[PDB]
Structure 1
Amino acid sequence: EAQTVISFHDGHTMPQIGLGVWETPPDETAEVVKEAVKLGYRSVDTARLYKNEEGVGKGLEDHPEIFLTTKLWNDEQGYDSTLRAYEESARLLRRPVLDLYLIHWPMPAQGQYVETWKALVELKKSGRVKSIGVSNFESEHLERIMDATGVVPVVNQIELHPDFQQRALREFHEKHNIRTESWRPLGKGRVLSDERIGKIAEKHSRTPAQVVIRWHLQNGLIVIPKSVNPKRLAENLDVFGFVLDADDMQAIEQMDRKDGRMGADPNTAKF
C-alpha cells in the first residue's frame, strides 16, 4: 500500500497527505517534525503566523526530500514586502527554494493581494520557489489574480470538511485546474463522534478520523491534518489500506451544511 500524490498543472507533484504544524510551540516543533518524518510524513505545512519556521527548518535539517509549504501573513502583503518575507521564510526554514508558497488570506479590504500574487509570479519565474498558490481565496479573488497576471495558482487551501464541503468553489477550481487543499479536514473534531461517520468506521474497521481523511483523499483533495499525539499521527497516516464505496461517499456528501463553516469568512475576516 503506497501513499498517493497529487500533481499540479505546473508539472510539479505534492504528497496528498501532509502535516499541518499549526498548533505547535516553536520549542518542540523540530521534534514533532522529526517524529512525523519518521512515521512516514512526506509533506510539512506551516505559516509565518505560527512563528515556528525556525523549528520546522531545524526538524527537516537532513530531510530536503520532505515537501515544504509556507504562507505569507497578511501584514506583509505588497510586492516588495512579499519578496522579502519569502526570502526571510526561506532562511528560517533553511531551504533556499521552497516547494510551495501561499497567500494566507486574501484580505480584500487591504487592496494588496493582487500585488502579492505578482510577487509570487515573480518568485516562480525567477526560480526562487517551485510552486505558488493561495489560501482562503473565493472564486472572485481567484478570478481577479488570474485576470491581472495570466498565472493560475496550483492550489487553493481552504476550510473543508464533511460539514462544509466547498462544492461550488471546487467546481470553479476544476475549470481552472486548481487543486484543492483542505485545512480543518476534521472540522475541529466535530466529526470524530458523528454516528453516520461511526457506522462507516465500523464497516471498515477503521477510526472516524481515518474514514474522514480517506474521504478527502478519494475526492482528490490534498489533506493536511494536524496532530500533537504521535498516536494520532500514525493513525491519520494509515489510510491507504481501505476504500470507501459509493454508498459511503454519498452518505458523507449528504452531511454538507450551509452553516457548516467554522472558521473565518474570507470576505469578512479581520485580524
Structure 2
Amino acid sequence: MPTSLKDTVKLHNGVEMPWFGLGVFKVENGNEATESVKAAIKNGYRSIDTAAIYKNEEGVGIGIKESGVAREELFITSKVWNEDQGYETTLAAFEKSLERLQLDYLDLYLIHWPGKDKYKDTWRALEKLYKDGKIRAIGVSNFQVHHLEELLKDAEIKPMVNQVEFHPRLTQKELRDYCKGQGIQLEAWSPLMQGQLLDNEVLTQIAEKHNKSVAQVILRWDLQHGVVTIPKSIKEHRIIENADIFDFELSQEDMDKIDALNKDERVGPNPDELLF
C-alpha cells in the first residue's frame, strides 16, 4: 500500500510512523551501527529501530547526526530493557537512551518484553514521559493478547504499537486481529526470520515470478498485511535491495500461499517463557 519509503501509517494519537524502517538488532556499536544507519537514511529510509539492550544507541545517534536529514523527518524508536523495568528505573533508562542517542525526544519508546509483573509500572512511566512531551508515541514489544488485556485494565493511554516477531513461519493471526480491533499498530521484528527462509521453495517461486528476491517478497507481504516492518541489514546493497518493494504487488493467491508457511516458529524468545 505504501508507494514509497516516505509512506506512513497514522497511529491512534495521529502520529505518522513510516511503514518501512531499519532494524539494528545484533548490530555492533560504533561504526557498524553508524554506517548501516547512514546508508539507510541516504537511500531514503526514515525510520530506525534500536533498543538499549542492542548496545548500539551511540552509533545509531552518530549515524543520525551524520546522515544530513533533519531530525524531525526521522522516526527513532528505542526500548526499555527488561532489567530496567519499574517506574523510577524506566524514567532513568529513558534519559540514558536519549543521552546515548544524542536526542532531545524519541519518536517511539517501547517496553521490550512483558515478563511477569513490572510492565504495568513500566507503562505508567512511559505514560508520564509521553505527558512530559519527551516521546511522540508509546507502546510495547512482544506482548501477547493476554498482556495487552491486562495492561488495558488500568492504562490511561492505550499502546500505539506492538512490535512482535512476525514472518511467514510465525504469522501471528490472532494477535494481528486483536491489535487491529484495539487500534494498536503491529510491527514486525526480525521480519526476514534472520535469513532462515532464504531458500524456502514456496517463497522462491513467488520471487521468481515477480523477478524479486525472497526478502523482497517477505517484506512486500508484511506491507500487504498492514504490518510496519523493520528489516535488519548491514550492507548498503542489501539495505537498498530490501526497500525496493514498491514496484510490484503480490496476488491474493500468493499472499495465501505465504501465510500457509506458518508453523508458530520463533527465532527470538517466547514472551510467555522469558520471565523476569
For normalisation by structure 1, the TM-score amounts to 0.96
CA RMSD of aligned residues (A): 1.2
Between the aligned partners of 1:72 and 1:137, the Cα distance in structure 2 is 14
Q: Which runs of 5+ in 1 are unaligned?
A: none
Between the aligned partners of 1:92 and 1:38, the Cα distance in structure 2 is 22
Is residue 110 of structure 2 the alignment partner of residue 106 of structure 1? no
4+ long deviations beyond 6 Å: none
Q: CA deviation at 1:270?
A: 4.7
- Counterpart of 1:14? 17
What SS does the aligned partner of 1:91 have? helix
- Counterpart of 1:172? 178
Q: Which runs of 5+ in 2 are unaligned?
A: none
- Counterpart of 2:123? 117
Is residue 215 of structure 2 the alignment partner of residue 209 of structure 1? yes
What SS does the aligned partner of 2:196 have? helix
Between the aligned partners of 1:129 and 1:21, the Cα distance in structure 2 is 20
Between the aligned partners of 2:243 and 2:106, the Cα distance in structure 1 is 23
Is residue 56 of structure 2 the alignment partner of residue 48 of structure 1? no
Q: Deviations over 1:127-162 (max 9, x none)?
A: 111000100111111111111123211100001100
Between the aligned partners of 2:23 and 2:4, the Cα distance in structure 1 is 21
Q: CA deviation at 1:54?
A: 1.2
Between the aligned partners of 1:150 and 1:162, the Cα distance in structure 2 is 34
Structure 1 segment 230-241 matched on structure 2, within 5 A: 230-241=236-247
Between the aligned partners of 2:110 and 2:165, the Cα distance in structure 1 is 15
Is residue 48 of structure 2 the alignment partner of residue 37 of structure 1? no
- Counterpart of 1:196? 202
Amino acid at match of 1:174: K
- Counterpart of 1:266? 271
Structure 1 segment 58-207 matched on structure 2, within 5 A: 58-61=62-65, 62-63=68-69, 64=71, 65-108=73-116, 111-207=117-213
Q: Deviations over 1:214-258 (max 9, x none)?
A: 000000001001011211111101011110011111111111124
Amino acid at match of 1:32: S
Between the aligned partners of 2:207 and 2:35, the Cα distance in structure 1 is 31
Structure 1 segment 240-259 matched on structure 2, within 5 A: 240-258=246-264
For normalisation by structure 2, the TM-score amounts to 0.94
Q: Number of paired residues?
A: 268
Amino acid at match of 2:95: E
